[PDB]
Amino acid sequence: AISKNLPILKNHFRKHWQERVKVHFDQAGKKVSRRNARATRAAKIAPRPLDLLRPVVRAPTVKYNRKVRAGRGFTLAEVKAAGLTAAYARTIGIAVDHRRQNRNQEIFDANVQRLKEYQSKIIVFPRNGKAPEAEQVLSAAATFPIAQPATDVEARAVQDNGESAFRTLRLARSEKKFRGIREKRAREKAEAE
């Protein structure tokens, strides 16, 4: 079973695979069922808006850190700085993440201002009774979209201090490459009697 000039294929069908075939015949089913599930949650949830407030966050790794992206919750620092407690911010549809830490000021002001605008654009019904029907906005994500931070201006003055950029890269690369060796030349040399 090797013949002709054909690409060598790797079709893993040597277990009892026919036993584990999942045809998503219920694809339309489960969408109908998912839409109804939300239409019930909408109605159960009073004028509350189906989702919670999510923070801005810079995506990890050298591939996605350009983008900004909704994170889990708001850190204890941002919540406080935006003037409320963790325990209470939860009952106000705000997601709080005890695990996230604040190391970048920009993101920090970003989320604290995100909490200001959230508070300013909601209303919290009294515990009493009244329940002054005020009709649900359905998301919150949609209400307070997350936008990509603008980083510069369209045009600007060309400044050429004259230093190759390319060669800056080679040099910075090299300095790291010989950093430990050149330190073994400082310990063997400062050792000289």
Partner: protein
């Protein structure tokens, strides 16, 4: 669909087009890639030279992404500017006011230099340039601004 299939045409002739001498048995050569060093080696060297044996280094738990670095040539480059805005800067090429192109914002990792861009000054922010890419930018009066 089955009505265009050649087996409709084979109905009535004894062998289904599979030969009376040679038959259509189960697996004559053996199943799969069996005997690529033996009865099937003529077909593996040629069509597949290089198939057997090892080369280079192993790399446990390599995460592609570490190596994420799409490439863009001066070739294009001016395409990262919307077309209306584009002609505005192509004309009135100067210092003082020269477009900034955040090629990482466009999702590129390195600028290569495939070839020739107009003599307009451009300010190129990028993570990595090639020596030529960077030189060819300057000949047009632009600079490269190493970012991260």
């Amino acid at each position: 669909p089955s009505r265009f299939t050649k087996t409709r045409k084979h109905r009535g002739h004894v062998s289904a087009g599979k030969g009376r001498i040679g038959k259509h048995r189960k697996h004559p050569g053996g199943r799969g890639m069996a005997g690529g060093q033996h009865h099937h080696r003529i077909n593996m060297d040629k069509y597949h030279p290089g198939y057997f044996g090892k080369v280079g280094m192993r790399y446990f738990h390599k995460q592609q992404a570490h190596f994420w670095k799409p490439v863009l040539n001066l070739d294009k480059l001016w395409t990262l500017i919307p077309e209306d805005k584009r002609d505005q800067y192509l004309k009135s090429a100067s210092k003082e006011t020269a477009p900034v192109i955040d090629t990482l914002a466009a999702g590129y990792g390195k600028i290569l230099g495939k070839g020739r861009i107009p003599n307009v000054p451009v300010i190129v922010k990028a993570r990595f340039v090639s020596k030529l890419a960077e030189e060819k930018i300057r000949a047009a009066g632009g600079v490269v601004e190493l970012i991260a």
